[PDB]
Amino acid sequence: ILVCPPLRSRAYTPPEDLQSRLESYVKEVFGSSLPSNWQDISLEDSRLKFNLLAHLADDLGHVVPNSRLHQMCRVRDVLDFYNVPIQDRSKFDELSASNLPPNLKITWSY
Amino acid sequence: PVRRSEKPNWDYHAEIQAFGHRLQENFSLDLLKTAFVNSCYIKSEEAKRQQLKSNQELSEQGTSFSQTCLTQFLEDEYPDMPTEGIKNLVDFLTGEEVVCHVARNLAVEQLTLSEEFPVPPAVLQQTFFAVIGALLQSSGPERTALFIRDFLITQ
Amino acid sequence: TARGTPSRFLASVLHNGLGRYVQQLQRLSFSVSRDGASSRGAREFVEREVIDFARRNPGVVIYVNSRPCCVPRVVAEYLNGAVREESIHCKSVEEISTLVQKLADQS
Amino acid sequence: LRNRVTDRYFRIQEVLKHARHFRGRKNRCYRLAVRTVIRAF
Amino acid sequence: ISRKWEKKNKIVYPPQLPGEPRRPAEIYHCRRQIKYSKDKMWYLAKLIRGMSIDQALAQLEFNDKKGAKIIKEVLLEAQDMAVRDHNVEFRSNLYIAESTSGRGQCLKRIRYHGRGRFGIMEKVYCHYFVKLVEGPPPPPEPPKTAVAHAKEYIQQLRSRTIVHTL
Amino acid sequence: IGIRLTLPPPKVVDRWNEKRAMFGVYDNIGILGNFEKHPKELIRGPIWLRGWKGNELQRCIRKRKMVGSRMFADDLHNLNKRIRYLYKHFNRHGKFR
Amino acid sequence: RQWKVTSEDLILIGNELDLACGERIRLEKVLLVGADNFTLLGKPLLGKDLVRVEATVIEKTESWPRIIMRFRKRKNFKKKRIVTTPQTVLRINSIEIAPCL
RNA sequence: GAAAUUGACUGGCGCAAUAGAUAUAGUACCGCAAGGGAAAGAUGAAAAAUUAUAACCAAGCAUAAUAUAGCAAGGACUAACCCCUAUACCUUCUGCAUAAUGAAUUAACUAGAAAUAACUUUGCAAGGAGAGCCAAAGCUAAGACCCCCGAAACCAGACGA
Ligand SMILES: [Mg+2]
Ligand SMILES: [Mg+2]
Ligand SMILES: [Mg+2]
Ligand SMILES: [Mg+2]
Ligand SMILES: [Mg+2]
Ligand SMILES: [Mg+2]
Ligand SMILES: [Mg+2]
Ligand SMILES: [Mg+2]
Ligand SMILES: [Mg+2]
Ligand SMILES: [Mg+2]
Ligand SMILES: [Mg+2]
Ligand SMILES: [Mg+2]
DSSP states (O other), X not given: OOOOOOOOOOOBOOOTTHHHHHHHHHHHHHOSOOOSOGGGOBOOSHHHHHHHHHHHHXXXXXXXXXXXXXXXXXXXXXXXXXXXXXXXXXXXXXXXXXXXXXXXXXXXXX | OOOTTTSSSOOHHHHHHHHHHHTTOOOOHHHHHXXXXXXXXXXXHHHHHHOOOOSHHXXXXXXXXXXXXXXXXXXHHOTTSOHHHHHHHHHHHTSHHHXXXXXXXXXXXXXXXXXXXXXXXXXXXXXXXXXXXXXXXXXXXXXXXXXXXXIIIOO | OTTTSOOOOOOOSSSTTSSOOOOOEEEEEEEEOSSOGGGHHHHHHHHHTXXXXXXXXXXXXXXXXXXXXXXXXXXXXETTTEEEEEEOTTOOHHXXXXXXXXXXXXX | OOSOOSOHHHHHHHXXXXXXXXXXXXXXXXXXXXXXXXXXX | OOOHHHHHHTOOOOOOOTTSOOOOOEEEEEEEEESSOXXXXXXXXXHTSSOBHHHHHXXXXXXXXXXXXXXXXXXXXXXXXXXXXXXXXXXXXXXXXXXXXXXXXXXXXXXXXXXXXXXXEEEOOEEEEEEXXXXXXXXXXXXXXXXXXXXXXXXXXXXXXXXXOO | OOSOXXXXXXXXXXXXXXXXXXXXXXXXXXXXXXXXXXXGGTOOSOTTOSSOOOOHHHXXXXXXXXXXXXXXXXXXXXXXXXXXXXXXXXXXXXXXX | OOOOOOTTEEEEESSXXXXXXXXXXXXXXXXXXXXXXXXXXXXXXXXXTTEEEEEEEEEEEEOOOEEEEEEETTTTEEEEEEEOOEEEEEEEEEEEEOSOO
């Protein structure tokens, strides 16, 4: 009998040292000899792409979806995707967290 | 007939704020709530407890200001009426029928905390003049004079 | 037909507009459903347009009830004890905005 | 007998609610009523 | 079929406050499936509407109709149930508030005509309904007086307005 | 009055039966199974209506041609009469010629 | 249209007036102004310096539904339509005159 | 209207008491006979609970007859009428308020079926289609178009003096 871990949230705040951590990661995965434009190195090799994306996913808790994996052509793009924040909440909570005027009342009978 | 409080969609603080805003008056919130709380509602709710501030000061202030201010408007616009006629016009404007009609179509009854529904006309008149007293305490004599001018000379 | 329906004379609520204008709309109750394709337009209206309407009309209390229903509705309560129940079933967001504004300007 | 009409009551009653204040059988019998509501409009 | 007249008899009321009128007793009775026409029974009921109970019994006793005898029996048993179960004080202190006749369940028989022709006979049946109310019979409405006629004419003349103008 | 006085009893449907959960499976058996089979031989029904559409007269002709021999006497008589009527109607009546 | 208005009056305009409710506007094309003991007559319009009318948009509503039915007999001709005309209720507040004759 | 030749179980986008079998039944009833041929029933877990809260809904009536004047209304109006306007409907027709047709009214049932092409939208394309067929942009697939009732008659086999 295997226990199931509790359900993870999709809330992902982009960390402040995303630049320096991406530097660390690209350094162990693509080797010590960096091209000066580390921005613009290709991800055409699927093994190198798997290693980089899997390391980033296991660190940051955020995984690139299958509909964006083909888009993930450069670590430029990978930096863009991990820069983009995604947010998880019920939208009843979203409508409440939006600054409601005092004459508007929301009830959630669900 | 059942009161709008026991009718489903209701929120008392929102209704009080909308009352002040749709009357375009900067009411004090606690003063308005105490102007809507009546003594009979007080007595019914201790009785329910065995199984705070009333209208009276605000009602008396609003009533006295209504008499004085209405008499002032009437005898300034019509200098030739004698005192009996000015007094009778003032008693008509602060009478039961006119004040209850104004309170009902301004929805003082919906916000009135009382014992019986429909609200008895004496209770509704007292609640309306407590609202007048709250407006006098919150805004000032000229502003509540404009309020009285509108909502009674229009009658 | 005039002979088959009631009639009345032109009137205001309490001599409205003489001293000051009082908005006769008091309450708006929006029954909307989370999962209803009929309620999609009202869902968009609650998402985008109800905040600005509530800010523009501070004298009106707006309740929004998200509950499982097939026909989304709006109930407008007016100061003289009037109640108007209207179906916003399968209406776009601009049609709902036009209707809710029209209810606001009614007596 | 698939696909019978089930809201014939409501169609009859919208014509009859326009015909309600008439005199005779034309305020309640649908045939005579619908011949008169049209003329009224 | 429906028996709401009997259920009306079995309706009950809350207890009375000591400071309000006495709420006079109401007694509902009916007879069903009377071998008689509802129109003729209507003539008898319209005769005994609004009478006192004894006045109705006298009129039905000296009328010459089968419906009159049947209605007399129904009135007697309604009076008996009135002062036996509904706490009517005096058996003469009742009047007929409602008295009407309805259609009953009829039967279709053939009526042989000439040639090969035929008709359908209707073995007509009817119901009789009565309501007895405790108290003296209400006074008949007095006929309209010339003073009242002049008054209503003056009221129309004073209710006239200037139409289709400001 | 032609209308119910009470609500009809609720018509609950299981959207996840065997039949609904597995509707449509193997409908691409020809183009995903080296064309050894056909959907027209996936179809189960009457023996004269397996992979064939037709209008009414064609259906009646096909039924009489295929299962005419092993058919009941009055059913075959009604089928002969129906074919005769449908022939007359389709070849002799209508708006367009 | 020509409206004979006074102060504290109500009129019903049969179209929308692109104004918010409770909005104070000035009516200008004054054909006539008058009191007891005197009237002033424009030719055909009075001076805007001479007379002002003040009105207030107090209601923006719709009319009751109007039926348009067309019927021609023995020709199967039968047509129904429902219209709701927009309307605007104005309260005439004040009528002011200035000494300019 | 050919042929040679080719090769080929246990469910319901059914009905639910005017429907679905005519069927509760070939019974009742009708006819000498062959033969024709119906209608309908609805409580509850318990009726060894006959009770009383079930209604509300067609036509028809009752509660509750009527008041100068006129297709029965509409414009209206303080006001039901009084004032003003106004030649029922369908079919048929050159043309019908027609004193031409049909209809007492209510409920239910009761009348547009498809090819050849064309057009629109896809797929593939000098080829298209899961053989066969068509092809000087075509072929394949789908969509979309063709009613109901009624004679006097004619023939076959029975049943009847
Ligand atoms: Mg049957
Ligand atoms: Mg049958
Ligand atoms: Mg009826
Ligand atoms: Mg006339
Ligand atoms: Mg002719
Ligand atoms: Mg003519
Ligand atoms: Mg005639
Ligand atoms: Mg003739
Ligand atoms: Mg005729
Ligand atoms: Mg003819
Ligand atoms: Mg011949
Ligand atoms: Mg012989």
